Amino acid sequence: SIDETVARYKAQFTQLDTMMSKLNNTSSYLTQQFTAMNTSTVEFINRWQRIALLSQSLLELAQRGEWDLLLQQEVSYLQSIETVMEKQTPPGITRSIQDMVAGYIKQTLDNEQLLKGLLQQRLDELSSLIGQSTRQKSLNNAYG
Amino acid sequence: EDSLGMEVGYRLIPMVDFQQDGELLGRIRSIRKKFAQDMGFLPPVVHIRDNMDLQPARYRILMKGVEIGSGDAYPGRWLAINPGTAAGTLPGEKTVDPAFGLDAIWIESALKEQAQIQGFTVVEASTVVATHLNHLIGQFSAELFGRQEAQQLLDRVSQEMPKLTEDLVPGVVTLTTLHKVLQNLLAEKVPIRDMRTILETLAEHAPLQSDPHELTAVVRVALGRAITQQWFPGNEEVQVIGLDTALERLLLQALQGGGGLEPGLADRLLAQTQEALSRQEMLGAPPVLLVNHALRPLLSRFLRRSLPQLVVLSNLELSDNRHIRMTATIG
């Protein structure tokens, strides 16, 4: 069933391309909040650690080719960034906790630059797979 | 001589013998049967003849005595076709597939499953010859439809719907004109199955038009539902190649006598079209080029002469309810 698998290639292409566009919406929000940093204190480290951890999950799933699971984790990664948008920085910021978060915010940026680079090469591979599958469909109709 | 003939070597005799194997005879009958129900006319019979002077595994395909294709076939072996994505190589006689010209290898029967895992398409010997024969029939569909088959089709449809055919030939259109219109339809892979709409719309435009090329254009719009569904089956997004609006007006100006383009720009038009077939292929979209109605016969005859796989439809033929998106551009 080549026609059915090509449909899956097209559907995954648009879903990954939509994620690569929302990846730039969050890349501008994280870069500006990063430069803005250069008891409720605990629930401030976790809000920026959940972002750094979910960005690690997406990069690991991209390296391992789990694209279906990568699209399920995109939702939780987008929900976690909005939780940082609703809640501002607490007033009690020490020089040590502010620069520790600045290392976690910088971790997500270097994780998205590798994630976007991997999310792009999958779009480049899916375009090859669709082209090869339609050429293979012409062979099967002639000899079938 | 014979309209469609095929000569074969003595190793292919079992493939073409009812006394033993004869796998080809059943396939050739099925080829002619489906061709009569798809394109709407029965192709000429294939005269098969043994030739012990020919090479043992060689076959020839002739049309009116002229050789239109040769090749080899080994009944005990399989042909491993490489569509460009296969890996490694297989032992056997390296050759070329007769339909698309791809690289292929005749492999022993013990390598079929390994060929498949390596990405080859493995095809049996009788299918190689049948597919080659079936490929040439579609390529010469217009030529194999002579004036004899025109009269034969007319009498066949004159008994089904006598009121339409009686008043038509040779009153409004002669047999030569009707034949040339049907040839133009097969020449662009549009079937002549719906003889009602073809002849119905012929009777409405024959008293006002006697040009076969002009009558063909009107018929294609009358067959627009069939032409649309042939390349865009169902009800989804129609993805076509288009012309750059600057190029479309340049071409309309050249036909209107405002000034033609340089012959070097024509070479780019052929190249940009072939690139549009590749870009359309990477998207899983049909290889069709949608152009303004005034430009359709020109670009069809011009591009398809070099790129026959290209389909050129006019804007007046696509159904107005479909969602059209231009996925590739020439220019």
Numbering used by the authors:
A (entry chain D): 5 to 42, 59 to 164
B (entry chain A): 360 to 690
Task: Please give the exact wording used by the authors of the publication that reports this structure.
Several constructs were tested and the highest quality NMR spectra suitable for solution structure determination were provided by a ternary complex formed between FlhAC and a fused FliT−FliDC construct, wherein FliDC consists of the last 40 C-terminal residues of FliD. The ternary complex was readily crystallized and the X-ray crystallographic structure of the FlhAC−FliT−FliDC ternary complex was determined at 2.75 Å resolution. The solution and crystal structures are essentially identical. Two distinct interfaces mediate the formation of the ternary complex. In the major interface, which buries a total surface of 350 Å2, the FliT helix α4 juxtaposes with a hydrophobic cleft of FlhAC located between domains d1 and d2. Two bulky non-polar residues, Leu102 and Tyr106, emanating from FliT helix α4 bury their side chains into the FlhAC hydrophobic dimple. In addition to a network of intimate non-polar contacts, FliT Tyr106 forms an optimal hydrogen bond with the side chain of FlhAC Asp456 (O–H⋯O distance 2.3 Å). Amino acid substitutions that perturbed the binding interface decreased the ternary complex stability, with FliT residues Leu102 and Tyr106 and FlhA residues Asp456 and Leu461 being essential for complex formation. The minor binding interface features a salt bridge between FliT Arg98 and FlhA Glu640. To maximize the binding interface with FlhAC, FliT undergoes a dramatic conformational change with helices α3 and α4 merging to one continuous, long α helix.
Type III secretion systems (T3SSs) are membrane-embedded nanomachines that export dedicated proteins from the bacterial cytoplasm. FliD and FliC are found in complex with their dedicated chaperones FliT and FliS, respectively, in the cytoplasm. Here we report the structures of the ternary complexes among the FliD and FliC flagellar proteins, their cognate chaperones FliT and FliS, and the export gate protein FlhAC. FlhAC folds in a clamp-like structure with four discrete subdomains (d1 through d4).
